Design a protein around this ligand. Sequence first.
Ligand code: AGS
Ligand code: AGS
Ligand code: HG
Ligand code: HG
Ligand code: HG
Lengths: 343, 344, 226, 215, 215
Amino acid sequence: HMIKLSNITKVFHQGTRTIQALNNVSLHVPAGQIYGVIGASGAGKSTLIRCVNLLERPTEGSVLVDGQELTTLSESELTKARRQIGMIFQHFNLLSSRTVFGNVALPLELDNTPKDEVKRRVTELLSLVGLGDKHDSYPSNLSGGQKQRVAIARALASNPKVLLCQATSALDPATTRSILELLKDINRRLGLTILLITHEMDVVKRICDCVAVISNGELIEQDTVSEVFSHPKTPLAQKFIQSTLHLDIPEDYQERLQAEPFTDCVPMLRLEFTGQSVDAPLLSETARRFNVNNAIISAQMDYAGGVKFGIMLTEMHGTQQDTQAAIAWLQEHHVKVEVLGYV
Amino acid sequence: HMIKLSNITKVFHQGTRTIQALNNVSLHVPAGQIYGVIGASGAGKSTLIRCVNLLERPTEGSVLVDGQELTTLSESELTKARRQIGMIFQHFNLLSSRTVFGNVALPLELDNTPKDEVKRRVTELLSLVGLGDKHDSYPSNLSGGQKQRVAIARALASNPKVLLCDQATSALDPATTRSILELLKDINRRLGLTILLITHEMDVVKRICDCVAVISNGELIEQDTVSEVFSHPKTPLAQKFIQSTLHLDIPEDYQERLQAEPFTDCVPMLRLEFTGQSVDAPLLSETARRFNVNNAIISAQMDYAGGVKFGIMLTEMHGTQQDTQAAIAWLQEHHVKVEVLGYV
Amino acid sequence: KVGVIVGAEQQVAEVAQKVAKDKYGLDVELVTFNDYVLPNEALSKGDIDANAFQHKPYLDQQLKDRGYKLVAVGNTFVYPIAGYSKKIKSLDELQDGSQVAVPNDPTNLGRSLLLLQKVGLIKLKDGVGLLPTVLDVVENPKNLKIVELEAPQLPRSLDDAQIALAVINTTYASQIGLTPAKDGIFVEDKESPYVALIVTREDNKDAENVKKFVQAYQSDEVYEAA
Amino acid sequence: MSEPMMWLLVRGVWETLAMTFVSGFFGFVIGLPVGVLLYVTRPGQIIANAKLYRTVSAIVNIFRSIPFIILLVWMIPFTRVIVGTSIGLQAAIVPLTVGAAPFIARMVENALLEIPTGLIEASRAMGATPMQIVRKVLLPEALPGLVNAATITLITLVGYSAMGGAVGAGGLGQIGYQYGYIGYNATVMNTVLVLLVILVYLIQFAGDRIVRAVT
Amino acid sequence: MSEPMMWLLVRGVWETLAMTFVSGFFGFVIGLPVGVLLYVTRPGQIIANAKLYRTVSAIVNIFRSIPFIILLVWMIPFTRVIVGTSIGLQAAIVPLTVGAAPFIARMVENALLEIPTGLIEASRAMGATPMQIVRKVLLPEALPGLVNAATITLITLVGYSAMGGAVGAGGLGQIGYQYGYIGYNATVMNTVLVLLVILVYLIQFAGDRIVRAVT
Ligand SMILES: Nc1ncnc2c1ncn2[C@@H]1O[C@H](COP(=O)(O)OP(=O)(O)OP(O)(O)=S)[C@@H](O)[C@H]1O
Ligand SMILES: Nc1ncnc2c1ncn2[C@@H]1O[C@H](COP(=O)(O)OP(=O)(O)OP(O)(O)=S)[C@@H](O)[C@H]1O
Ligand SMILES: [Hg+2]
Ligand SMILES: [Hg+2]
Ligand SMILES: [Hg+2]
């Protein structure tokens, strides 16, 4: 296990009042694993990730990185260890005095690496983040995404064993995908360990191997991406996950929705798949069996660990009796169905 | 039209090289309309949104907000006008000298509004953003999301006619995000607030944007309704970008087991794309009933707008190779873009 | 009120204050100055009653420059100035390029210049009197270099590796125990117009307070305590 | 250390104190508007006026280039116009204040310059008037630097008053020059030095406490 | 303005110039390490040592509290040890340098304080040694403030040298005091003033240009 946090607790005394930003939190990350942190705003996520770097000294708790305990460590040993860990701040903390190239080169300089090596490696990194042409411009001249990519490259400069990332919040979907592909490549090539904060579940179920959830400075639950996004436990956690689902009900249907069934009505229904068999054909089968017609209005469906989960908003077309029979059958097969009205 | 930008062009001289951050961009936003901006990083979006506020003075171009031309306006008139426009910066630019309450009160102070009114209105806003309990703490003591909501509340303090968001929900968890966007929609439909916003979360775009605009290399590739942009877009650049916003995941599990060649008892794996299709039209239920094939949804991104349903769907076509190909043929007949990826 | 200089000529005036507040019991408010015009400007402006630091050429200068209406109303002490060197006992032992220390103030600057022309080392231009300056040095066979410090600073300059000679006053000379006449290697005979010249305004010179202070200043205690 | 010397040291303390603090107060009264101007009239700033910047900067540099003594002299008449005398404590304070104000203004300029750009951008975007921005943003946000500058400036003003005091108001520094140094009185000299050290220590402690108070 | 007076003004210019710039140079040589220390040993900083902070701060305040004249005097012997004399230009520079260095250090401390927090956090996180942080982050990023401080400091040093020069030095300020003022020569006075104004303008222009060079 490349990372181990045990019984971490951190209090802050803002002023009049004191806050338990973190309260007895423990989390372990193997080598070459990818691990996400998620939770409502102000829950402690940034606090925790800083506890790893030891940018926040836990008032009570134990921190271990690469088998080395840090709480009890000299400033010099701590510095040397930190030269193994890359961090990406929410706001990139770049040097204005140095261009893109300089910011990226800095960690290499810290290791007094040869000048030619610095040139080569920094150029490679800039090419990878697509900032090849921007090497000699200053952070004061860069768009948000550009500076974020600068910060990423700097994090990776020294080829650290650990990365502490919302490292993709200022990047368009395409650039986002490029960057995440790169991280995945590094993880599977050089066994890089990564811990990352995000509010974009998209990212989470894109690359996270395991996931962790936080509420009021407490680690509610950790599990695989699927198990968390699929039948989560802990009413707090499952409440959060429900929040992450798309319960849209477009205004068009809201207007036309009738709590009461009328003749020739078409039921409108929300479906939730929680660890359902991907191979199992349920809606095609339903159409063939009951001769109902399921017009997919909206869909969030994701696949992980051989199962498919997520919500699906649809119209059930046919006869009220056929519709109710199809609903019954789908419920038999562990599809959580809720009828919202009749259009 | 609450907002009108015409022939906007902006050059920056960083150093050695000069850059056409924006090149002859024009965009019109009606009153009480919600309008999104999307585009590859470094395309000009933030620059464009700043042009409205005139935080960036276009070298050649015309800006009109509430029928008032700004390029040609005195600093004092410009100040008075700006007191009508709220902005949310990507990085919140909060005052460290003032608590949550103070930052939010500041714009009200600018109007010399009564002290009691300031208390009431600021408290209301903080409750709305869920920062009721944080009013008297300082930004240095706040998590990112909290500071973002502080910035939001301040933007809305003065009840402006126009809002300029620069990724105003990027630091907010899904739940907080939905609460905030619900609030914006309520305001837009109650007080007819006009909104222009930048985002990389297409999710947001198709959540509230009435119309959308796409930017590449300082040029406004296209603007249209959410659907029309995400559904049969034009301009190879634009459609390329939109393709970028699609998932096309092919989970590693299927990648491993994928075979370019059909073998006996094979199950075709197929990607489907819906581009402005009739929602009522049941096609896969109908296909299952007709060809006795089985379409197992592996993954799905489907969104509804303007009476149509669009998005991608990764599925298995189950049955006999012949039945599978016939079902594929029918689905293509009905304007579903089908691509067979292999056989599992 | 009375102006005074922040130089050494101050306990000279403190004994006079003693005698004035002793025999005549007048609350005269004292003042000291670190420049050489502000007592005169104070008089002409009416702040202070008198001033007890300047001499007749300097007075005349101040009545010529800035047009002050003042007149000399006091006797004085001998205030002798003389050359001194702890490096040599004679002028025969002075060599070329040797630096020479003199008070940067106008009065003593000019008087030291005339003392240096008296000793025969340098000679200045014609028709000046007691307030010459470095502008005037026209004969300098030994190539001495003239130095203008705050007087208190040169006596240790005699302890300076650079300085060979310093034109110093007598009270400062006596600080470290060098009398002009015999301990000082070379000296200045009676130079009449360096008088302390207690001054007042032409109008105020006739106030009882003024006269009674001037009395308190000129007395046996003031002359012997000197 | 006779009883008269005790009282004289008392009055020297009072002189140094009044001079330093009053002069710094009024020097700020002046230079702080001047500094805010120098900041605000720069190329790019809230009220960016090159002509006005050059004028104010010219005034500032001109006053900076006058020696202390020539300044005091040229002030004498206006000094009297103001305080009715060119001698003593207030008469010394006035020229001290005029000498200090430009340096204060430049220090202020420096402090404001260290304000972030995004905050000025936000203040302009909200639609605040220049004076609104000044009173509500520039000075509030730059307050720590301003206070540290004031600390520095008063520490300087101690010795600066010591020097410039010698139109009849010398304070502790004058006393040390006269009785501690001119005429070897080790006791008086050491007393003056200890008082001055205590004074600077007090001023710096106050400044640092106020600075840390502001987060 | 005789030819001898021409030459005297030339030498006064040279004295003012050498004094000002040499003294500022070495005063920085000294105070910049001291300021970096005062910054770094603060509670919370890279090398946060309360004892060392108190020691350095005490030294700085002590030197600040010494009047210029007592400083020059007490320096006299080591002034000679260094330059072999206690009179003239270099002898004047030495005490000038010692007088200025603490103020320089406090100016530095102020500038470094205006550095952002996140940058120190990142520098520590990367694993840079304290001196690596200093040489690669603190001084580079605070460079505009440092240059502005240097500008301020040299502008002060002009008149400060004018004053302290009068152990055989003084420069243009001494010349103005003696011949411009003590002997009513308006021409000489105006010439001195014009030279001083030109000097300060050149210095401020250089400082502003260099600062704007740094973005
Ligand atoms: N240095 C600090 N001083 C005072 N309070 C702090 C400090 N750091 C964090 N906090 C508080 O601790 C709580 C959690 O902080 P964070 O970890 O930054 O929030 P989060 O869990 O990362 O979620 P967000 O809002 O999406 S960044 C918040 O209420 C902060 O106000
Ligand atoms: N002050 C500036 N000086 C020089 N160039 C700038 C400046 N501001 C922006 N740019 C350039 O403008 C281009 C467009 O980027 P922006 O409009 O600022 O942000 P964006 O492209 O809309 O979105 P991001 O932040 O990249 S996801 C970038 O290539 C920048 O280099
Ligand atoms: Hg293991
Ligand atoms: Hg990441
Ligand atoms: Hg938004």
